[PDB]
Amino acid sequence: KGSGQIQLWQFLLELLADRANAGCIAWEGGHGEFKLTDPDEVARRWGERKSKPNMNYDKLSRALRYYYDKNIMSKVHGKRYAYRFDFQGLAQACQP
Amino acid sequence: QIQLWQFLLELLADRANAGCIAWEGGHGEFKLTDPDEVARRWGERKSKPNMNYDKLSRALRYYYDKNIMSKVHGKRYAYRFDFQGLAQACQP
């Protein structure tokens, strides 16, 4: 995988594992589907974690496209801010 | 094939499973609302019919040393997910 500090997938899972964050990000729809209830707030919070003050939703959504090819995530068609976590694809990326 | 941590995350990513397992308490903490049901469901997935809560809890405590899961204090049937420790175990 590689390699360094906190990555977007980890931060999103941390946010999704706390119901206190339901106002900006939440598990919704089933089968690893989650929705960005407040896309700009998720982006602002990721900006604080990585000490990147110029962080916005455009840059955040750009970083999610890396996970489609790596098969860690996918984007729900028809919907605007609904994404899906692929735990089988994540576990595969974890294996040596 | 599938490991316990992956199966638990899959269960926890669906609110329809709230009756047996759910994110509760914050900071990666989750509770086994029905411990025997989680164990029964894990038994179906791994085709292990002899699976019970005793065997499941033993496997959950194994992730403490691997730093994927952490012990929760002051709460019964509660476990904590360490996403930092998981990400570290994912790195080569």
DSSP A58-88: HHHHHHHTHHHHTTSEEE-SS-SSEEEE-HH
- Structure method: X-ray
CA distance B49 to chain A (A): 23
Are B8 and B45 in contact by the 8 Å Cβ rule? The answer is no
- Nearest chain A residue (CA) to B22: A17
Residue A85: CB atoms within 10 Å? 23
Contact criterion met (CB < 8 Å) for B13 and A31: yes
Are B5 and B12 in contact by the 8 Å Cβ rule? The answer is no
Nearest-5° Cα angle at B29, B88 to B27: 70
Edge-first strand listing for the sheet containing A73-75: A26-27, A33-35, A82-85, A73-75
Nearest C-alpha neighbor of A82 from the set A27, A38, A35: A35
Query: Mutating which of B8, B9, B27, B33 best tests the A interface, going by the most A Cβ atoms within 10 A?
Result: B9
Are B42 and B51 in contact by the 8 Å Cβ rule? The answer is yes
For B12, the domain range is 1-92
Q: Could you give the number of structural domains in chain B?
A: 1
Across the strands, what pairs with A73? A85
CB under 8 Å to B58, separation ≥6 — which residues?
none
Q: What is the CATH classification number for the domain harbouring B69?
A: 1.10.10.10
